Write an enzyme that holds these catalytic residues in place. Structure first.
Site, PDB file in Angstrom:
ATOM      1  CG  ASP A 122      46.631  45.147  44.081  1.00 28.57           C
ATOM      2  OD1 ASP A 122      45.634  45.803  44.449  1.00 28.57           O
ATOM      3  OD2 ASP A 122      46.820  44.809  42.894  1.00 28.57           O
ATOM      4  CG  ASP A 151      50.574  48.369  35.819  1.00 28.77           C
ATOM      5  OD1 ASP A 151      51.084  47.368  35.273  1.00 28.77           O
ATOM      6  OD2 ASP A 151      49.536  48.913  35.387  1.00 28.77           O
ATOM      7  CD  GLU A 206      50.188  44.508  38.202  1.00 29.08           C
ATOM      8  OE1 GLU A 206      50.173  44.281  36.974  1.00 29.08           O
ATOM      9  OE2 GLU A 206      49.400  45.304  38.754  1.00 29.08           O
TER      10      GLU A 206
END
Lengths: 248, 253
Positions: free
Chosen positions: A152, A12, A42
């Site tokens: 993911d 993230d 990400e």
DNA sequence: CCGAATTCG
DNA sequence: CCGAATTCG
């Protein structure tokens, strides 16, 4: 010393809050385990430059050159890179794509794949369209090579069956390992509070799929990492990292 | 013979939630109601002050309300033309916006009618639930007593697709718009190109407000005409509502 | 009260 | 980035 280890993790990099600090933490983990292969999601250009700088014993492949993307790091001298393929999903509205790679680990031919599927519940259908496209690429992948996907998925256990289920040749490692009690969830808002939300959501977003060619490689272990809070007061990410050990 | 077997009704989502220029649009709406003076009036999204005002002006009407508080629907019946037999209120067991089916049973010169109004669950997000209401409405049109004419008129919040998705209308129930060969002027009851009351920049043309019909015997009552109203912006600067009013003329043996 | 983009919790 | 409730035009 023949053995093979990988790590998938949605770090993230969009959460700028304490970003570099969480980055140094993640790299601390990566250096600690020093796996042969690392899947990340990400990731953003500064984070990328930092990864390239620190982990220099890795060949790094990116899903994109700008914005956020996924990445596959490969331990040099242990992993020889055969090729890399990038396939965009034709229906994305979030610039998502399937990052495939083909490598050679001590004679054993491997096909590693990563992706960050369409997020949120509202685009579930679209996500499904991506999922099939991923699965079909694992079977269509050469009969001679062993295929490993790790990424993911942003999925629910039901939704996978909803798409039509896994082929008889491809299996999720978590299921293959008898559904371990500790690895049950990779996105837990009870344990993780990085996004600062008051809900108890425990979802298994990050998944690893496997397809042996007769099989020469066996998946031995599966564990989580990034389970501890940094000095900044936050976890490295909202998602929990996923290490997997295998042997030949 | 002031009324030669003619019959007129009006359904209209007045949108009492849009407080912007509300009272002036209200007197405008009442100007319409007084102008056409229909036998029955169906209204949706009406609030207590609006109710009291309606009580003041349209005093030649007996008014029935779907609720006492918040927002609701209402059925006004011109007394001396319509005798009220009963009134029934049925809440949707699955509603989350306090919506409900307002049924009424009346007698017009021997012909017994059963009039129904509702404001189904709004937004795309509750489409399924809306469908659940629609069937429930339709079935109550089915379950409604024989010999009596059943008329529903309300804000259905529906698209032509959603009606087919439910399984389609029963063979005895007919949309008046469809019954009239689907006229181009009655095409939309919610048009954001023409109407700008909630101040929106989108080109949305939807037929939210609908009238369902069920004669039961061969038909003795036939719906003759269908027209829109509230077609002009008032002097107050707004249309009476975001929804277009819907007048319908019908005739009986 | 559309419908996709914030905000709230 | 859950998932149900505002907001803008």
């Amino acid at each position: 010393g023949s053995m093979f280890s990988l790590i998938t993790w949605n770090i993230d990099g969009l959460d700028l809050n304490n970003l570099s600090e969480r980055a140094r933490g993640v790299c601390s983990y990566l250096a600690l385990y020093s796996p042969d292969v690392i899947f990340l999601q990400e990731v953003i250009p500064p984070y990328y430059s930092y990864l390239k700088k620190r982990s220099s014993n890795y060949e790094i492949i990116t899903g994109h050159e700008e914005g956020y993307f996924t990445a596959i790091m490969l331990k040099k001298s242990r992993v020889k890179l055969k090729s890399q393929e990038i396939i965009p999903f034709p229906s994305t509205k979030m610039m998502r794509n399937l990052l495939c790679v083909h490598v050679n680990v001590s004679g054993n031919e491997l096909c590693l794949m990563t992706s960050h599927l369409e997020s949120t519940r509202g685009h579930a259908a679209e996500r499904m369209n991506q999922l099939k496209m991923v699965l079909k690429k694992m079977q269509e992948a050469p009969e001679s090579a062993t295929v490993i996907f790790a990424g993911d998925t942003n999925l629910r256990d039901r939704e996978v069956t909803r798409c039509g289920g896994l082929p008889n040749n491809i299996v999720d490692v978590w299921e293959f390992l008898g559904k371990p009690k500790h690895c049950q969830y990779t996105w837990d808002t009870q344990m993780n509070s990085n996004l600062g939300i008051t809900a108890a959501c425990k979802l298994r977003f990050d998944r690893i799929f496997f397809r042996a060619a007769e099989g020469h490689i066996i998946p031995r272990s599966l564990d989580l990492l990034g389970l501890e809070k940094l000095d900044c007061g936050r976890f490295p990410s909202d998602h929990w990292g996923l290490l997997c050990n295998l042997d030949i």
